[PDB]
Amino acid sequence: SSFSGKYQLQSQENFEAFMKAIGLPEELIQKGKDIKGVSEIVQNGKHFKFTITAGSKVIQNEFTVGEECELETMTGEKVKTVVQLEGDNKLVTTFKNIKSVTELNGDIITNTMTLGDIVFKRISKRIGT
Template identity: 45%
Template sequence: MAFSGKYEFESDENYDAFVQKIGLPSDKVEMGRNCKIVTEVVQNGNDFTWTLHFPGGRTTTNTFTVGKEADMETMGGKKFKATVKMEDGKLIADFPNYRHISEICGGKLVETSTCSGVVYKRTSKKIA
């Protein structure tokens, strides 16, 4: 499955319940609410560069190779190590307190994060 492209936030579901469950600081909660984040993905085989562009110019970039441990950063700014897996065309990463799954559905980037039974889903449309 080819992930490469730029995707702009289109919609999300269950944001408030999810960020409360993972303990995101209140300033980050407000920053992320209905935020027009642009996700830029560069894929070269199993190598990925995954960048989140926030309004105001802030970015977060995670670079990883499927199946190899990599240094990562959460949307809250916490650094950790993770091994991203590919299963059935989906990228799966276990963050410190939630599981994150990314997939392409109908040309859109769909990201689903789950923490203690609370599921957050973000859909982004391809813009480039």
């Protein structure tokens, strides 16, 4: 259960540019750019559940490492992909030509999403249990 916990965004880079590019409606971009969203992760072996909350908007997802899964993404689009572990503390997946890497270092999770030259980076910190 390496990843299990509750974490809140501390800061992020290129939210607006990234979200516009992938189809987030601009009213959502404007309300969302300064939201410090909360990620809740339950890991049980290869099985993951996570909830992302960003004011009024709650996305729940689940996947088993190494297997096909269906992920609901930022716009609501559901994509079929595979999430892999690269060691105990790093989740890697690709969907819609976006490469997503989620890495845990103690209490800090860094999420990097790359779409072409745009690198959307989010840094979050554990908040309690």
